[PDB]
Structures are given as structure tokens and as C-alpha cells.
Amino acid sequence: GTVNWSVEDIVKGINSNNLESQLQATQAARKLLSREKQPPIDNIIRAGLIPKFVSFLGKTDCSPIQFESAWALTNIASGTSEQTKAVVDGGAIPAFISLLASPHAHISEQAVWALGNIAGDGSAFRDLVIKHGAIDPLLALLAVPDLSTLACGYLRNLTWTLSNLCRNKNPAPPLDAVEQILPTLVRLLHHNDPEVLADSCWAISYLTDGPNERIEMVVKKGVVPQLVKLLGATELPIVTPALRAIGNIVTGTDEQTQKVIDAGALAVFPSLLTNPKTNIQKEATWTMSNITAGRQDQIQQVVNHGLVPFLVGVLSKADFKTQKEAAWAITNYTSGGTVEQIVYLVHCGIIEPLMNLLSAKDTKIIQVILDAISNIFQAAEKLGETEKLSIMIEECGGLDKIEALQRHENESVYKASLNLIEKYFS
């Protein structure tokens, strides 16, 4: 009946002064816009149908046309920025926010979805949705004693749209909006649905992707132990944003980093640093590099958790971008650690895989590695053991690399090499 109408027929029905004819044509537009292969969003926009869809959002006495136009506008808003802007330009934001309080759950849910697409376009539309007042009625939909009484799909859509209000960074969402959203986010982070959990972690990862004061707003809410638990989940869609949130937090202060350690996060890293998904391994190793950039007592916790052998492992074999994070983790370690912690690094076998990576063409990973060797040599000078390290570097073919890096396009790489040759290989 409403399957595969031409746009011309849709316009004809929507432009009739017959509400039932408009309903039929609107549903036909919805089905057109619902197909997978190239829905004709632009043809629908060019026919001038968005203002009519938006006015149908307000037809309280015909809830079916509210639903059909909400769905049609949702799918237009799901397209390019220009296509989303056309929905916004038609006045859809206040009309969708008014539908959040609809007694029809399926209409309210569709308005949640539509605002998620609009907010998800970028910071400006996100903040415009916030200025029109979306947050209060969105949160009111989740003000229930037990989240489990809400329909699963409804709860997932609410969580996803909330995460888009937490997303994007130039600028970050308004501080007061984040403060307003966070207690509901914390409650969603303890829900048992894996999709709600994944999108809740994503939202937290966005909020911690910023300056230390942004991290602190999240960390003060006590979520770190729950993030560490989710870090151990078997669902990769949960581990990935949980790890990104944890990695964001350890870019903050040493005190914020300590809350991650206190929560037991380091005990998960044997798995994460050998995880078969290469980007988990990379994110986990980046996280390690920001922990080894901390206090000596935090470096010591890395040691105690047996994580240095795992760093030797990723340095020895891993995709190259993970090995770069591992090199950073080692140089950070050698820059802040004690003599004993640096000596322990050599005893674990850091020298040979570190020398092997000097063959890379990445100029900055060589600067990073050269810095680490200089730091390890400085620890060796305090124990009179500079030679024993020189023989070890030369026995694994390292000396050949540093003496060959005496011919590099980068000036600082050349000079760091010859200084190591000058001072420890005479």
C-alpha cells in the first residue's frame, strides 16, 4: 500500500488537505527513507518535505503521523551534516524535545533517536540541542527505581543519545550539562545490558578525553572501580571503551592515576598486553606508557604486577604502532625510575628488542629509544657498570645500529648517536 511510492506521489498526498492522505504519504516516505541501499534523502529534502514533517510532529491528535514523520526525520538526520542541518533548519529540535514526554513510548523513543542523530553531528548541534532543553526530559525518562523495567531497545537508545551529548571536544560539552548528566551515566554504568554498558563507557571515555578538571568530574563520581571491572569483560565492545576511559584517566594527575592503580587495573594488563585485537594491545600499551610516566611508587606497582616482562614482549613482537607505544613506555620508565628499577629492566631483557627497533624508519621512535639507552647508561654509571652494558649492547648487534645512525637525516638522532659512541664506546 505504501511500498515504493514515487517522491511525486508522496508530495501529492502530503500536500492534500486530507490528514489520512497525509498519513499514508508520510508512511510511504518513511519506508522509502528506511531502505538500506541509498535512501533518497536529498530527493526528499529537495521536494520541500521537511517543514511538513516537522509540523506533523505537532499533530497530537494523530499519533501515527507523529511517529511516521519522526521516523522519516530521524533517517534524514542520520545522513550527512548538510542533511542533518536541513532537519535542524526546519525547526525539528524543539518539536522533537516536545515529543520526549509523549504518552506513546514508541514516539518518545523515536524522538530520543532523532535528537541523538542531531546531537551526534557535532559540537554546535550538540550544544544547540542542550540549549533547547533536551537534557531534563531525557533524564526524566530514566528516573525510575530500577532500569530493568524499561524496554531494552528504549534504554539502549536513551544511553546512546546521552553519549552523543557527552561527545566531541572543540568545545567540550558545557560543564553544567556534564554535571547534570553524570549521575544518570553512573547508574547506567552499573546496568547489566552489554550495549548500555558499552555506550556508557563510550560516554565516560568522551568526558575523560580532556584536561585534568574534566577527568576529575568523572573520577570524583567513584566510577573508576566499575570501569576496571568492565575492563575485564569478555565482550570486546565493552573492553574497548572501558580501556579508552582508563587510558584517558591516567593522562591526568598522579593522584587520578593512583585511583586506577588502587582499583586493581594493573592485574588486567597481562591479558590486555597480549590481547589478539591489535588496537586493544596498542591502547593498553599507550596506557602503560602514561603510568610509567608517573611516580617511582607507581613504576614500582608496574614492576610488582609483573608487567615489565609483558612490555619486553610487546617490544619484541607487536604491530609497529604498539611497539612505538612500548618504546615510549620504556623511555618514560627509564626517565622517572630509580637505579634499581632501571637495572631490573635490563635483567628482564629490554636491551635486545630495544636495539632491534633501531632499524625502524620512524625517526621519532629512534629518538625515543636513544633517550632510553642514554637513561639506562646513566643508571649504569652510578654503579660503575657502564662497560658491562656496552658489551651487552654490542653483543646483540646494537652498537652496529648506533654507529650506523651516525648518518641520519635528523640532526638530533645523529648527535645522540655519536654522543653514545663517544662516551660509552671508546
Partner: peptide, 10 residues
């Protein structure tokens, strides 16, 4: 992140 926007096909 996961998708910025979501299309509803049903």
C-alpha cells in the same frame, strides 16, 4: 567512539 549517527531501517 561507536557510530555518531544511526539510520533506522527495521
Amino acid at each position: 567512539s561507536n557510530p555518531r549517527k544511526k539510520h533506522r531501517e527495521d
